[PDB]
């Protein structure tokens, strides 16, 4: 039954991602460990002394703030790739795929999924970081020197339009499943089984949107377009990352993330 395929995907989403949209919009709105606001250099340094004490003692605050923010981004990406891999291992039919095709799907899918889910922790003024314990302002990131000021703003632009669709986690879980189970990734061995897998997920998504969002007549084709938008956003992101790896010393790539980008686009 498709009602339960959707429920299983949604339950695996709530289980595997440490931050979900309901939790995020609470923190983002107005407790015990409120988010420290990072809006200039002074507050970045204060936040680092509390949230990453070992690094400060290692002397990271001698490095350019842009380098520390980039490596903060990388650490968050590595953790999200780990969650996405477990989420996917929990997608019905994914674990039955060929080992090599699981790697291919995740390799090309993870950053599309990341930037989709990143919208959940963004508002027009900034984004949540450090497991809900920091809030870094969009204007502070815009204030960094090139090229680092170009990292986050295209993702804010995507997220504000994405958030206007007013999806909830039950929608987003299916959307991310669909991103991962994409039958036209380069390098796929058994394209036929993946397309049938994708067809079933997208079928559930289309049906779920019908019942969950009866007011938005074209929400399904809108989300198809967002999937294309995300692939272009990821292509452009990989280009900026390659610029940074080559031009900026100190901003070395984490080994897990380097393998993801290797031969990607
Ligand atoms: C927004 C925020 C919150 C918490 C810590 C930090 N700074 C970081 C975070 C990370 Cl994961 N790494 C670094 S420096 C790593 C290095 O110089 O090798 N600096 C930042 C930039
Ligand atoms: C969930 C979350 C919140 C904040 C930042 C990130 N990682 C990002 C986001 C953006 Cl727009 N850019 C980067 S550059 C480092 C990388 O390509 O992994 N890393 C992630 C994955």
């Amino acid at each position: 039954d498709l009602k339960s395929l959707a429920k299983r995907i949604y339950e695996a989403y709530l289980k595997n991602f440490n931050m979900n949209k309901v939790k995020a919009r609470v923190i983002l709105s107005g407790s015990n460990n409120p988010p420290f606001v990072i809006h200039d250099m002074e507050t970045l340094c204060m936040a680092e002394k509390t949230l990453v004490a070992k690094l400060v003692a290692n002397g990271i605050q001698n490095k350019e703030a842009e380098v520390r923010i980039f490596h903060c981004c990388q650490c968050t990406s590595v953790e999200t790739v780990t969650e996405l891999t477990e989420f996917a291992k929990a997608i019905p039919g994914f674990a039955n795929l060929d080992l090599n095709d699981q790697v291919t799907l995740l390799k090309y899918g993870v950053y599309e999924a990341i930037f989709a889910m990143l919208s959940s922790v963004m508002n027009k003024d900034g984004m949540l970081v450090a497991y809900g314990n920091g809030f870094i302002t969009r204007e502070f990131l815009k204030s960094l020197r090139k090229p680092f000021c170009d990292i986050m703003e295209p993702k804010f632009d995507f997220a504000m339009k994405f958030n206007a669709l007013e999806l909830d986690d039950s929608d987003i879980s299916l959307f991310v499943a669909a991103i991962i189970c994409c039958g036209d990734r380069p390098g796929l061995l058994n394209v036929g089984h993946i397309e049938k897998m994708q067809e079933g997920i997208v079928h559930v998504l289309r049906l779920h949107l019908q019942s969950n969002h009866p007011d938005d007549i074209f929400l399904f084709p809108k989300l198809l377009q967002k999937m294309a938008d995300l692939r272009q956003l990821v292509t452009e992101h990989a280009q900026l990352v390659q610029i940074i790896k080559k031009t900026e010393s100190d901003a070395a790539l984490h080994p897990l993330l380097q393998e993801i980008y290797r031969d990607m686009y």
Side-chain angles (χ1 to χ4, degrees), residues 29 104 188 199 256:
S29 289
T104 297
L188 294 180
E199 183 174 13
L256 178 67

Side-chain angles (χ1 to χ4, degrees), residues 29-59:
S29 289
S31 210
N32 185 14
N33 277 116
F36 191 68
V37 175
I38 297 167
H39 65 84
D40 62 352
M41 292 304 181
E42 177 184 39
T43 53
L44 174 66
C45 293
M46 294 165 56
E48 288 175 336
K49 289 178 190 175
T50 294
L51 303 173
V52 293
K54 153 105 284 190
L55 293 187
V56 180
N58 279 8

Side-chain angles (χ1 to χ4, degrees), residues 37-45 47-48 52 55 60-78 127-130 135-145 147-153 156 237 241 244 250-253 257:
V37 175
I38 297 167
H39 65 84
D40 62 352
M41 292 304 181
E42 177 184 39
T43 53
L44 174 66
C45 293
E48 288 175 336
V52 293
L55 293 187
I60 62 162
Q61 293 188 338
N62 293 330
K63 303 182 179 189
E64 277 186 273
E66 294 75 8
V67 165
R68 287 128 66 187
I69 291 174
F70 188 61
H71 288 285
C72 180
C73 289
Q74 289 187 65
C75 283
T76 308
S77 296
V78 167
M127 54 176 308
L128 294 174
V129 304
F135 176 85
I136 187 154
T137 66
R138 182 183 188 171
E139 285 296 322
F140 178 58
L141 298 166
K142 282 173 65 171
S143 84
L144 306 173
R145 76 171 172 84
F148 296 94
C149 61
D150 304 329
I151 298 165
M152 207 61 40
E153 184 65 16
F156 278 106
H237 179 80
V241 163
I244 293 172
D250 261 46
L253 227 41
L257 305 183

